[PDB]
């Protein structure tokens, strides 16, 4: 599970939920959505990711350099995650009505899902880092 901290001022934490929401939108809207409708949902995931990464970069200064590292670690990974979600989405768009019509959509669901899981692991490291740097406070 996740740390229980004071989330009221945790912009990281909120950006994670939003991203998870966007990812969740995608999941149970692919079956319904048309090909041009794919760009929009993938865009929101992207949008909430850049929000997220921005609020982590704002923090990265005030925290330990061994954590700066695996944070920057998964931050890199998340870009690689979005890259794949876009490209699988483009495939899915271009391969509506062909052999791997469905197979490309499975790949979108995978890519977004693993994006959500990584974002969580980002939150987790961030939580630990705040603790390790006397920065964290218990739920209010």
């Amino acid at each position: 599970p996740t740390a229980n901290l004071d989330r009221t001022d945790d912009l990281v934490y909120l950006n994670v939920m939003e991203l998870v929401r966007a990812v969740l939108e995608l999941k149970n809207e692919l079956a319904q959505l048309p090909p041009e409708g794919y760009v929009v949902v993938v865009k929101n995931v992207g949008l909430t990711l850049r929000k997220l990464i921005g609020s982590v970069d704002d923090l990265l200064p005030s925290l330990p350099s061994s954590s700066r590292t695996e944070i920057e670690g998964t931050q890199k990974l998340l870009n690689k995650d979005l890259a794949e979600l876009i490209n699988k989405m483009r495939l899915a768009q271009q391969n509506a009505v062909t052999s791997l019509s469905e197979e490309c959509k499975r790949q979108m669901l995978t890519a977004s899902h693993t994006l959500a899981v990584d974002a969580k692991n980002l939150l987790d490291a961030v939580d630990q880092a705040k603790v390790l740097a006397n920065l964290a406070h218990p739920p209010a």
């Binding site: 760009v39 993938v42 865009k43 992207g46 949008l47 990711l49 850049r50 990464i53 921005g54 970069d57 920057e72 870009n79 979005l82 890259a83 876009i86 989405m89």
Partner: peptide
């Protein structure tokens, strides 16, 4: 560092 991400973000739409 944000240069790689807004590259992908520009590409769609």
């Amino acid at each position: 560092a944000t240069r790689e991400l807004d590259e992908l973000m520009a590409s769609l739409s």
